[PDB]
Amino acid sequence: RRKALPPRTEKMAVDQDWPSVYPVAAPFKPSAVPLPVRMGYPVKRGVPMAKEGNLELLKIPNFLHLTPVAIKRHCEALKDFCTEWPAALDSDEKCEKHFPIEIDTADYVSAGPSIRNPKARVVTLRVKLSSLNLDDHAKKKLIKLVGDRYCKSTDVLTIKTDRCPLKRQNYDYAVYLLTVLYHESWKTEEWEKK
Amino acid sequence: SLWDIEFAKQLAAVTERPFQNGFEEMIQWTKEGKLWEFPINNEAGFDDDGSEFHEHIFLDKYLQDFPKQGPIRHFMELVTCGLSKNPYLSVKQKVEHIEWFRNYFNEKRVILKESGIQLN
Amino acid sequence: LSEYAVRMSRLSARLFGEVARPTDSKSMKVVKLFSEQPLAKRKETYDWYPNHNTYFALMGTLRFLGLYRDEHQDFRDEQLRLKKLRGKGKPRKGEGKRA
């Protein structure tokens, strides 16, 4: 017993809201899409193949769930979650005068069974030395102490932290490192007079 | 209480429809644990025994029992420093390395004494 | 080079948690050995192969439960059947040589 039912395109109202049809990421069933679309290479007299049974359209990632109406709606639903950005911070100058310390952190998304990315551990600490309370002696001693992690032209100190399994651990270790650098830059010792 | 469980099951049975949309599929899947959490953080699922960076970097505590001035300090401070840089290992494992060395050196006292340095 | 520079360097290593006391080029290898994942432990190494036993076994069973259909195994079968019919089979173990 052979059953052939006409496609949804027949029952489709002209003004029917589209995001109703493709709320989520979808394979592109040709039956559920109203637009005639021919893709494929043609043949000498012929045209591009029809949308029905077309394997090539099936390969295409389709942005059909993301049609701009659907985005407007989506975002307007998301306006409730987002929190505002503080006014006075609008310029970088004030950013530095208020917040001296930048912590860079990477997060990676790749498709597959496992989430685990080795590169995610790394935490980078960038800090201007002009925003620190250092003495002349202490500043010179810190510069010599850290060495290459200090850029002499831009005055931005860099701490790259790797060694620990978690990014939170590495964040703590970079902060700790910074703390200790500052505490041990101000201590004068015996051999410093030599 | 098996009866409370069959009650929660009989309730969850009237509660559970076959999914009415994709967003529903994804919601149930996420709560289930099948789907991923977003926005993605790769460290999700793994906290590493709630350890903190000082139980990683500073291994001095386990060198307490070991000869303090010898070449054994040299060697073991190298091993130590190595483990200090090692991301792929847990705290437990590092300590197990340390202890294997404790046990192996304390296994051979003889060869160490004969070696030309008296070693504890 | 000075004593000041060396004191500074010693302090730098001790601080950042790198090797404190002066070592040979040859001995530093030790640190390297524990800094890394030993070669035979990497997932690229011990996990290299897919388990072929699980694939072959599982799809065999699923064939016998009549879910999976293996045309290759079917071909092998029918060929073999026709071969035992024609009279050349596989000798039962121990029988072939001496007899």
Binding site: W191 | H54 | R7
Partner: peptide
């Protein structure tokens, strides 16, 4: 030659480092 004393423990407990 020279062996200088660096205190791991002092800076440790102080900075939450032990």
């Amino acid at each position: 030659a020279a062996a200088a004393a660096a205190a791991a423990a002092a800076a440790a407990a102080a900075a939450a480092a032990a």
